[PDB]
Every structure is written in structure tokens, then in C-alpha cells.
Amino acid sequence: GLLSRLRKREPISIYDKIGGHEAIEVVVEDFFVRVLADDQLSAFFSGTNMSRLKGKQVEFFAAALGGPEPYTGAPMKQVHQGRGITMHHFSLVAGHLADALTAAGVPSETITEILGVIAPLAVDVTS
Amino acid sequence: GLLSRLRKREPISIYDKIGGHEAIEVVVEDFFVRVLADDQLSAFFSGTNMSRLKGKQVEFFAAALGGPEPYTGAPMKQVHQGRGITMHHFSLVAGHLADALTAAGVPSETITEILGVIAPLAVDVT
Ligand code: HEM
Ligand code: HEM
Ligand SMILES: [C-]#N
Ligand SMILES: [C-]#N
Ligand code: NA
């Protein structure tokens, strides 16, 4: 945990400073309420099992932001390839993530930092 | 609350100035009485959950005015998109908010300050 990490003089991860697994879970839940309420986005998920997806997204974001738990989902490029997702869609999704982070009280500077980790993933996500 | 924030040497926000979350609740109720009575505005709210909207409006205004809690609703552009809202409509709503603030006894100068925060939002709403 964070205490062990600090005892080892390891820098505080984004994961730890935003509140770890519980924070990520809450953010991902809200993120998906936002995404599924967005008529430009909801249809992408029509044939999707949301229950499982939220789980994999928690694992993915946690791992991306410095958490210890494994990602147990499929590779980004394979999952998203062929879904007709454009940079327009990717950007809307990123906007919803930023909104969920803001709603959870994460400082704007940290939101920007998180967008810096996530934005390069568009190369694997978009059509 | 305001007491703890002053102990931290935070400058007084507009939110804290006008009476905080409880003052904003009261203003928002009166605001919508005015809005829904306005024939030029009321049809936009046909079918709207007023209780929910009012709560999100309290959150929004409280946050914009420097309050302690984040806004948790949808952003202004998304929510108002495709409704054909014009500068005329926005101006009417801003007018009703100012009148509600006036009725609540907020000093004219502070209402002017609040309108300075609200008026730029028209780019997203319209
Ligand atoms: C913001 C960056 C994104 C990340 C980190 C991400 C991550 C993920 C992850 C972890 C999964 C689960 C993979 C699995 O099932 O093993 C997934 C699936 C999925 N993603 Fe994303 N994604 C992103 C952007 C997007 C965008 C922009 C769209 C469409 C607008 C999208 C649409 C989908 C859909 C529809 C699935 C589920 C496919 C199915 O039905 O199983 N994703 N994504
Ligand atoms: C003073 C600027 C305004 C602000 C701060 C504002 C704020 C908001 C907020 C916070 C919501 C709720 C968002 C959510 O559900 O997450 C909302 C929705 C809405 N607004 Fe505004 N608004 C403004 C101007 C206007 C104007 C000028 C109109 C039309 C005359 C309008 C009509 C509506 C309607 C119809 C909804 C949707 C209610 C529903 O979901 O059924 N707003 N607005
Ligand atoms: C993808 N969520
Ligand atoms: C919007 N009221
Ligand atoms: Na695919």
C-alpha cells in the first residue's frame, strides 16, 4: 500500500493520490452513467455486458495510474479495432472521464495529468 | 463551512458571501417560479423533473460562485445542445435569476458580480 511505498522512498502514484481502488471504482461507475446517457456514445455499448466492462475498466485505469492489481481484460487495439470509433468519440469519452474526475473532487491539475496518460491510448482505440 | 475556511485564510467566496448552500436553495426555487411562469421559457421544461433540475442547479451555481463542493451534473454545452435556445432566452433566464437574487436581498453589486460569472455561460447554453 501507500505506507509501504513511502517506507521505500517510492514516489506517490496518481492511483494513490486520488484515493486508490475505492476512488477508481466510484469514478468508473459515474464515468459510465455519463457515457451511456450520451446519445453520441450509448449505441457503441448496446451489445456490451456493462457489469463486466466496468470491472475491466477499473483494472485498466488502476494499472495505468500506478495501482498494483492486474488488468485481466483483452488488449486495447484488439478490443476496439473495427468498432468505427473516431477521435470525436474518443474525445467525448475523455470528456466524460474528466467530468467524473471533477465530480469526485480530483484537482484539475491531476485531471490533466490523467488525460496525459490516457490521450495517447487513442492510437489503439480509434478506427 | 465559512468558519473553517476563514480559519484557513481562504478569501471569502461569492457563495459564502450570499449565505451559502441554504441561500442558493431558496433563490433557485424562486428562480424557477419566475422561469415557469414565463410563456417564453416554460415549454422548454415540459416533462422535466423539476426537483432533480433544481438540485443540479443548486450544485452548479454553488460551484460557479466558489462553493466547496464540485458540480456533478452534465456540462452546459451537452445538456442544452439541440434545444434551439437563443440569446433572447438566455437573457430572460439571467434576468429571472437576478430578480430572484434581488427578492432574496442580495446587494445589487453582488448580483452584478454573479451575472459576470453567469453571462459567459451563454456560449455553451445557446
Ligand atoms: C478512453 C480510453 C479507453 C479505454 C482506456 C478503454 C478501455 C476498455 C477496456 C478495458 C475494455 C474491456 C476489454 C475487455 O472486455 O477485456 C473496453 C471495451 C470496450 N470499449 Fe473501450 N476504452 C476506451 C475508449 C473507448 C471509446 C472511445 C469507445 C467508443 C466510443 C469504447 C468502446 C468500447 C466498447 C463498445 C467495449 C466493449 C466491447 C464489448 O462489447 O465487449 N472504448 N474498453
Ligand atoms: C443561466 C444559465 C443556465 C444555467 C447555469 C443552466 C444550468 C442547467 C443545469 C445545471 C441543468 C441540469 C444538468 C443535468 O441534468 O445534469 C440544466 C438543464 C436544462 N436547462 Fe439550463 N441552464 C441555463 C440556461 C438555460 C436556458 C436559457 C434554458 C432554456 C430557456 C435552459 C433550459 C434547460 C432545460 C430544458 C434543461 C433540461 C431539464 C431536463 O433534463 O429535462 N437552461 N441547465
Ligand atoms: C470503454 N469503456
Ligand atoms: C436550466 N435551468
Ligand atoms: Na474488435
UniProtKB/Swiss-Prot annotation, chain B:
Transmembrane segments: none
InterPro entries named in the record: Globin-like_sf (IPR009050), Globin/Proto (IPR012292), Globin_bac-like_CS (IPR019795), Hemoglobin_trunc (IPR001486), Hemoglobin_trunc_I (IPR016339)
Binding site for heme: H80
GO molecular function: heme binding; metal ion binding; oxygen binding; oxygen carrier activity
Claim: Ligase is one of the keywords in the record: no
Cofactor binding note from Swiss-Prot or TrEMBL: Binds 1 heme group per subunit.
Top-rank taxon: Bacteria
UniProt entry keywords in alphabetical sequence: Heme, Iron, Metal-binding, Oxygen transport, Transport
Function: Binds oxygen cooperatively with very high affinity.
Subunit field text: Homodimer.
Family: Belongs to the truncated hemoglobin family. Group I subfamily.
Record-given protein name: Group 1 truncated hemoglobin GlbN
Native source species: Mycobacterium tuberculosis (strain CDC 1551 / Oshkosh)
